[PDB]
Amino acid sequence: VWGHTQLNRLSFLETVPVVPLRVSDESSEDRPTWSLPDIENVAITHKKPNGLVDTLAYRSVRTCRWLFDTFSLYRFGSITESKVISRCLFLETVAGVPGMVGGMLRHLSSLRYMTRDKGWINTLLVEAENERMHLMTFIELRQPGLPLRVSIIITQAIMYLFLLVAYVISPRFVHRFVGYLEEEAVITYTGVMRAIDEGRLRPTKNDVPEVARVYWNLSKNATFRDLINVIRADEAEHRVVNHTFADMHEKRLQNSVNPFVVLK
Amino acid sequence: VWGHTQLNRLSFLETVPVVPLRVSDESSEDRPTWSLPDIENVAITHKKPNGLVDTLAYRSVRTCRWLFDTFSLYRFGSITESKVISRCLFLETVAGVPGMVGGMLRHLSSLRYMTRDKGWINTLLVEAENERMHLMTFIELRQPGLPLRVSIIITQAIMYLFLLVAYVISPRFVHRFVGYLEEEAVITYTGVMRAIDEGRLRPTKNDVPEVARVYWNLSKNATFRDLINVIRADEAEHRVVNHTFADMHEKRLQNSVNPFVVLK
Numbered sequence: 001v002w003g004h005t006q007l008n009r010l011s012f013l014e015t016v017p018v019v020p021l022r023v024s025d026e027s028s029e030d031r032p033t034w035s036l037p038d039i040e041n042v043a044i045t046h047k048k049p050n051g052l053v054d055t056l057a058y059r060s061v062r063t064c065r066w067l068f069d070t071f072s073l074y075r076f077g078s079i080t081e082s083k084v085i086s087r088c089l090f091l092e093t094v095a096g097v098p099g100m101v102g103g104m105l106r107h108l109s110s111l112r113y114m115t116r117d118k119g120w121i122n123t124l125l126v127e128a129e130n131e132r133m134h135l136m137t138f139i140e141l142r143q144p145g146l147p148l149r150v151s152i153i154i155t156q157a158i159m160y161l162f163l164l165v166a167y168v169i170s171p172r173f174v175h176r177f178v179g180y181l182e183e184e185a186v187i188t189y190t191g192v193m194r195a196i197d198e199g200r201l202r203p204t205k206n207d208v209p210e211v212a213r214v215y216w217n218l219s220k221n222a223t224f225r226d227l228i229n230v231i232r233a234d235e236a237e238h239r240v241v242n243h244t245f246a247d248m249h250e251k252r253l254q255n256s257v258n259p260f261v262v263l264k
Numbered sequence: 265v266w267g268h269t270q271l272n273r274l275s276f277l278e279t280v281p282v283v284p285l286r287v288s289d290e291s292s293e294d295r296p297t298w299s300l301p302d303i304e305n306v307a308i309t310h311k312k313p314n315g316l317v318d319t320l321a322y323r324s325v326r327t328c329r330w331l332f333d334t335f336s337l338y339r340f341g342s343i344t345e346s347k348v349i350s351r352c353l354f355l356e357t358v359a360g361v362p363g364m365v366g367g368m369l370r371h372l373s374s375l376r377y378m379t380r381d382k383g384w385i386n387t388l389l390v391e392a393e394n395e396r397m398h399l400m401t402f403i404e405l406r407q408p409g410l411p412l413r414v415s416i417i418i419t420q421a422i423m424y425l426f427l428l429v430a431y432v433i434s435p436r437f438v439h440r441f442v443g444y445l446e447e448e449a450v451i452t453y454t455g456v457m458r459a460i461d462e463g464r465l466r467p468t469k470n471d472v473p474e475v476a477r478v479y480w481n482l483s484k485n486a487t488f489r490d491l492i493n494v495i496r497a498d499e500a501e502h503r504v505v506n507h508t509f510a511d512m513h514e515k516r517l518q519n520s521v522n523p524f525v526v527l528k
C-alpha cells in the first residue's frame with residue numbers, strides 16, 4: 001500500500017518505533033540461491049595473467065596474502081575456529097569495498113556521460129552487499145577486540161583510497177585484483193572445509209545465525225560447514241564475474257552488456 | 265542455471281557477443297509500481313525547517329533554484345517541451361549523486377564498524393538507480409549539445425565533492441537538502457503536467473521510450489503526460505524518504521530500522 005496519500009505525507013519518523021527489526025530487511029531481496037550438494041564441487045582455479053597490469057594485480061594479491069598469513073600467524077600451530085572466524089572477520093571488511101567503488105564509479109560515469117550501463121552497476125552493488133553479509137554473519141559468531149576494531153578502521157581508510165584511485169586509473173587492474181582475491185578466498189574457505197571433513201577443525205558454531213539462515217535460504221539443520229560452503233560459492237562467483245569484467249576491459253568491451261544479466 | 269560448473273569457469277568473456285541488449289537489464293528488478301489515476305493526486309508540500317542545519321539546507325536549495333531558473337532562462341518566454349526536457353536532462357544528472365554517496369557511506373560504515381544497517385543502504389542505492397533511470401529516459405528524448413555535456417561533467421565534479429564532504433559531516437543536512445530538492449522537483453513536474461492539461465505545452469514525444477515503458481510497467485498507450493506523472497511520483501517518494509531519514513538523524517535514530525523496509 002504505497003500511494004499518493006503516503007507520498008504526500010511529510011515524514012514517517014513517527015512510525016519507526018512500531019516497525020520490527022527483521023533479519024530479512026538487512027539485505028535486498030536479491031539473495032544467492034545455492035544447492036549445497038552442487039556447490040560442494042566448487043573448485044580451486046587460477047587465471048593466467050595477460051600482461052603487465054595482470055601480473056601487477058596478481059603479485060600485489062600474493063604479496064598481500066603472504067604478509068597477512070605471516071603477521072596474523074595463520075600458518076603456524078593448528079587451524080582453529082577462533083583463527084578462522086577471526087581471519088574472515090577482518091578480510092570480509094575489506095572484501096566489500098571493491099564492488100561498491102566499482103558500481104559507484106560506473107554510476108557516476110553513466111550519469112555524467114548520459115550513457116547506458118547495461119546491467120553492470122547492479123552486479124557490483126549486489127556483490128558489495130554479498131560481501132557485507134559475509135561480515136554480518138561472522139560478527140554473529142565472534143565479536144572482535146579493540147585492537148582488531150582499530151585495525152579495521154585504518155585498513156578501510158587505506159583500501160578505499162587505494163581502490164578508488166586504482167579504479168579511476170585502471171578498472172581492469174581492479175577487477176583483476178579482485179578476481180585474484182577471490183581465488184585466494186576460495187582456497188581459504190576450501191581449506192576450512194577440508195580441515196572440517198578431516199576432523200582437524202571441530203567446529204562449534206553450529207547454530208547458523210538467523211541473518212545467514214534467511215540470506216542463504218538455509219535450513220535450521222544447516223551447520224557451520226554448510227555456511228562456509230555457501231560463502232565459498234559466493235566467492236567463486238565473484239571470482240568469475242571479476243575476471244570476466246577485467247577481460248572485457250582488456251578487450252575494450254567495458255561499454256558492452258553485462259553478460260551475467262541474462263545468464264540468470 | 266548457475267552452479268559449480270559455471271563458478272569454476274575462468275571467464276565468460278567469450279559469451280558477450282551472444283547476449284542481447286535488453287532494456288529490462290538496464291536497471292535492477294526493483295521497479296516502482298504506480299497506478300496513474302492514484303498518482304495523479306500527488307501534491308506539492310513543504311516541510312518546516314527544525315533549526316539551523318535545516319534552514320541551511322532549504323536556503324541552499326532555494327538559492328540554487330533561483331540561480332538555475334534565472335541562468336537557464338526557464339522563467340521568461342513560454343514553457344516548451346525543449347526547455348522542459350532540457351532542464352530535466354541537466355538536473356537528473358546531479359539527482360542520482362546523493363542516494364549513491366549516502367548508501368556508499370552507510371555501507372562503508374557498516375563494514376568498518378561491523379554493525380547492522382537495517383535496510384537503509386538498499387533504499388538509497390535503489391533511489392540513486394531511480395534517478396539514473398530518469399536520466400536514461402530523458403536522453404532518449406533529447407540528445408544534448410557539447411556545451412551542456414561539458415557543464416554536466418563539471419557540475420558532477422562539484423556536487424559529488426560537495427555531497428561527499430557534506431554527508432561525512434552531516435548526513436542530516438544531506439538528507440534534508442535532498443528532501444528539499446524533491447520538493448522543487450515535484451513542483452517543476454506538476455508545472456509540466458499543468459501546462460499540458462491547459463494546452464500551453466503541446467507535447468510531441470508521445471512514443472514513450474522503451475527504457476521507460478518497461479521500467480515503469482507503462483502500456484504502449486502511455487503518453488508524455490503519463491511519463492511525467494510517474495517521474496513526479498518517484499520524486500515525491502524520495503521527498504518523504506529523505507525528510508524521514510533526516511528526521512531520524514535529528515532524533516539520533518540513524519542506527520534504527522529503515523521504516524520503509526516494512527512499509528512495503
Ligand SMILES: CC(C)=CCC/C(C)=C/Cc1c(O)c(Cl)c(C)c(C=O)c1O
Binds near residue numbers: 068095
Ligand atoms: C587486501 C589486503 C589488505 C589483504 C588481502 C590478504 C589476502 C589476499 C587474503 C586471502 C583472502 C582473501 O583475499 C579474501 Cl578476499 C578472503 C575473503 C579470504 C578469506 O579468508 C582470504 O583468505
Ligand SMILES: CC(C)=CCC/C(C)=C/Cc1c(O)c(Cl)c(C)c(C=O)c1O
Binds near residue numbers: 356359445452
Ligand atoms: C543542486 C544544483 C547544482 C541545482 C538545483 C536547482 C534546483 C533546486 C532545481 C529544482 C529541481 C530539482 O531540484 C530537481 Cl532534484 C529536479 C529533478 C528538477 C526537475 O526539473 C528541478 O526543477
Ligand SMILES: [Fe+3]
Binds near residue numbers: 092131134185235
Ligand atoms: Fe567474502
Ligand SMILES: [Fe+3]
Binds near residue numbers: 131182185235238
Ligand atoms: Fe570476496
Ligand SMILES: [Fe+3]
Binds near residue numbers: 356395398449
Ligand atoms: Fe529525478
Ligand SMILES: [Fe+3]
Binds near residue numbers: 359395499
Ligand atoms: Fe529527484
Ligand SMILES: [O-]
Binds near residue numbers: 091131185
Ligand atoms: O570474501
Ligand SMILES: [O-]
Binds near residue numbers: 355
Ligand atoms: O529528480
